[PDB]
Design a protein around this ligand. Structure first.
Ligand SMILES: CC(=O)NCCc1c[nH]cn1
Ligand SMILES: [Zn+2]
Length: 292
């Protein structure tokens, strides 16, 4: 019996994060939201480990980062890692309107959606424990990468600073997981998810498992069994540095690639659909509960 993901509950966790305002590293709203997330994990029975680190951004800015890890059955050596980034981008640098290019986004889909879905998973995992140990890992400073308008070097390593840190410095010595699943932008209206490129390179068997689970759960029209783009995201560094086979569940829009709200001021609750959260969340539950 796999638990039923509650879309209303997940939607509320997304909204609560967005209600702090932008979660830009080094702002009081970021601090407050981090406290909220750590608090929710504790309330859902997780052992919480905080990883505070001074991460240096593309331009030399020190970011007071905090990765947040909630662990279930922590003494188990057979584990599944679930990841989402919780920071939000400080510049709406893909906005159609050039006047918005320096305005922080709300990151309802890009940030809050992955975290919200994993909080709902954590609530259920607490209630009805799967066989494997589950880690819920909220990664900071994913989205402080080089602005589009920057003229100069655009290095891949500017992104995903928190996952790079976690991947080099696991929260517990000897950490291992059977596989990982990263959720990024999993609440957008009308979103479809295709097999992402690095996911196919490092963990094609995990992609196969997830997409098959989605079909069996009735979400085959949301998880389309075709390949999409190759995307620099937290899973790239987790695969390369931590060597945990990790896939990215991330939308592919045929027109725009990313969702049309991506890195615009329109990434807010108006474009979140709880049915998208449900498709992704139920699929993740179906996978983790069927591991033995
Ligand atoms: C190809 C690319 O620029 N990816 C940026 C990482 C990211 C941010 N938000 C979602 N994905
Ligand atoms: Zn982003």
């Amino acid at each position: 019996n796999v638990p039923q993901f509650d879309a209303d509950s997940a939607y509320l966790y997304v909204k609560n994060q967005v209600d702090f305002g932008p979660r830009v590293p080094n702002t009081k709203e970021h601090v407050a939201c981090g406290n909220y997330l750590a608090g929710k994990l504790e309330a859902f029975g997780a052992k919480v480990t905080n990883q505070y680190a001074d991460l240096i951004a593309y331009d030399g800015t020190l970011l007071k980062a905090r990765n947040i890890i909630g662990s279930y059955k922590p003494e188990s050596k057979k584990r599944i890692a679930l990841f989402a980034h919780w920071d939000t981008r400080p510049w709406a640098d893909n906005d159609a309107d050039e006047k918005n290019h320096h305005t922080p986004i709300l990151g309802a889909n890009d940030g809050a959606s992955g975290v919200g879905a994993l909080l709902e998973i954590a609530r259920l995992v607490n209630q009805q424990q799967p066989e494997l140990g589950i880690d819920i890992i909220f990664l900071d400073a994913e989205d402080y990468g080089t602005p589009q308008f920057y003229e100069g070097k655009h290095k891949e390593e500017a992104w995903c600073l928190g996952s790079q840190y976690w991947s080099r410095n696991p929260h517990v010595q000897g950490y291992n997981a059977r596989f990982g699943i990263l959720l990024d932008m999993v609440g957008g209206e009308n979103s479809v998810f295709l097999k992402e490129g690095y996911s196919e390179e490092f963990a094609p068997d995990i992609n196969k498992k997830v997409w098959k689970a989605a079909k069996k759960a009735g979400y085959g029209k949301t998880f389309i069994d075709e390949r999409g783009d190759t995307i620099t995201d937290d899973h790239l560094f987790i695969n390369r540095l931590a060597r945990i086979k990790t896939i990215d569940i991330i939308p592919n829009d045929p027109e725009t690639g990313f969702p049309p709200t991506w890195h615009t001021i329109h990434d807010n609750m108006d474009h979140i659909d709880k049915n998208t959260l449900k498709a992704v969340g139920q699929t993740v539950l179906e996978v983790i509960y069927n591991e033995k």
